[PDB]
């Protein structure tokens, strides 16, 4: 069973230099097969790569399917995934779904399209799709989704305002330019759709130049729009970058919180004590040393011990702040005042 968890760690909880080289090599072979998918589209090389991509596909479907079943077995180390229904729960998760889809569809297209246009039309998309295989535990996407959810209001604000600016400014540019004719004789802005295309390409700072305004009204509006709207499609970079950085750094500094260990222990202990209270025959009663009403009060005190331990633990995992300093200072200060008053009275 030691071996089982060992290979699980190799595949699914990677670390070191061996695991890294493995996952690296996997990435490289899939990338190479993608480049052959690229070069299959070019007429010169559409024959070479088209044949190569039929044998490498067989190699890969064997490899990835093997890896899949090995992993599905090795997941018995986790207690979530022990048992048959456990392995089913393992197959249920998204990355495993994607892996399975890729493997099966590869096998099907090979066994069927052996004797083939839609075949390779699908092969190319599978080659593209296999890149999801790399990130195993999705820390990438989880980080992104987290930072988006935190900063959702800001981003909606930007999207709304930029959208509106685009719509209005493009309508006015349309009105100003709808009849203008280009040097080559054609009309760039025949419709409001074309003006929206212009606006998108502009406000986001791409500037293909396929559509440019000629009039003075158009140039005026475009200048002002270009100066004052472009920012709202560039904020998300700052927002998301700062979010990424902060999240990673705090998730790292959380490692050095050593106070959480006794808090965890205390939480466990008082919880089980609350539970074992419900058996009067328990041995947690001997701690107190008949008992008409002592039962109730003990249970109450334990319940609120549990609640305070719970909050203490929940705050034992978070970084300190000035507010906590202030609270503890006031608390200890007043304790000290009452103590010195106590001694002041004990003398008298």
């Amino acid at each position: 069973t030691h071996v089982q968890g060992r290979v699980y760690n190799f595949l699914e909880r990677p670390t070191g230099w061996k695991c890294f080289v493995y996952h690296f090599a996997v990435f490289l072979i899939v990338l190479v097969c993608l480049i052959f998918s690229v070069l299959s589209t070019i007429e010169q090389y559409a024959a070479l790569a088209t044949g190569t991509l039929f044998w490498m596909e067989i190699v890969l479907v064997v490899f990835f399917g093997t890896e899949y079943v090995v992993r599905l077995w090795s997941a018995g180390c986790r207690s979530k995934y022990v048992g048959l229904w456990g392995r089913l729960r393992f197959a249920r998760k998204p990355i495993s779904i994607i892996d399975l889809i890729v493997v099966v569809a590869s096998m099907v297209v090979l066994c069927v399209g052996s004797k083939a246009t839609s075949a390779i039309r699908g092969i190319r998309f599978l080659q593209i799709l296999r890149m999801l295989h790399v990130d195993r535990q999705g820390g990438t996407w989880r980080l992104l989704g987290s930072v988006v959810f935190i900063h959702r209001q800001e981003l909606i604000t930007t999207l709304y305002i930029g959208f509106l600016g685009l719509i209005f400014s493009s309508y006015f540019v349309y009105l100003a330019e709808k009849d203008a004719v280009n040097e080559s004789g054609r009309v760039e802005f025949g419709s409001y759709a074309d003006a929206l295309w212009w606006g998108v390409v502009t406000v986001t700072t791409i500037g293909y130049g396929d559509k440019v305004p000629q009039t003075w009204v158009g140039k005026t509006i475009a200048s002002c729009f270009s100066v004052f709207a472009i920012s709202f499609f560039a904020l998300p970079a700052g927002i998301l970058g700062s979010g990424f950085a902060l999240k990673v750094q705090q998730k790292q500094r959380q490692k050095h919180f050593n106070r959480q260990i006794p808090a965890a222990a205390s939480l466990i202990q008082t919880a089980w004590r609350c539970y074992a209270a419900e058996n009067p025959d328990s041995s947690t009663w001997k701690i107190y040393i008949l008992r008409e009403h002592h039962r109730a009060t003990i249970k109450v005190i334990r319940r609120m011990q549990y609640f305070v331990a719970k909050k203490k633990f929940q705050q034992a995992r978070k970084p300190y702040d000035v507010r906590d300093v202030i609270e503890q200072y006031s608390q200890g200060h007043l304790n000290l005042m009452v103590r010195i008053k106590e001694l002041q009275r004990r003398l008298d």
Binding site: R78, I261, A276, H294, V300, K311
Partner: protein
């Protein structure tokens, strides 16, 4: 729920011991020292702040009832206990040793009586190379 509030008012009468309708820090500490416990003042303060919502420093009977009302077998409490076990889990696979658990119950935090832990271990199927599934405990003691 009428029997429930009857028992809860009975229970509150033990602490009240007055027509006050409230409990002060000492009014709790006395009842605790009656049992031979000897808490600290800071202990009783932090204890009492987890029941009131008035900010007064005392527990009105509605607040006492409120503390009674909310349930241990909860979505969040379960997860908190589960996360608490994970501090003591090498390799994160959902299993912990027996002797490690006994070591942690009897030494860290509120130390336990040895007979308590002797009971605690045998609640779960401890065989199987000595490992134990701690979510089994969590389902047990969140069953109420």
């Amino acid at each position: 729920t009428e029997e429930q509030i009857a028992e809860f008012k009975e229970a509150f009468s033990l602490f009240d011991k007055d027509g006050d309708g409230t409990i002060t820090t000492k009014e709790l500490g006395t009842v605790m020292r009656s049992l031979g416990q000897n808490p600290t003042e800071a202990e009783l303060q932090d204890m009492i702040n987890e029941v009131d919502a008035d900010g007064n420093g005392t527990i009105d009977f509605p607040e006492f009832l409120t503390m009674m009302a909310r349930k241990m077998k909860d979505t969040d409490s379960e997860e908190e206990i589960r996360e608490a076990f994970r501090v003591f889990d090498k390799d994160g696979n959902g299993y912990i040793s027996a002797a490690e658990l006994r070591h942690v119950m009897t030494n860290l935090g509120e130390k336990l009586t040895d007979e308590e832990v002797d009971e605690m271990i045998r609640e779960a199927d401890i065989d199987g190379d000595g490992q134990v599934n701690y979510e089994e405990f969590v389902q047990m003691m969140t069953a109420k």
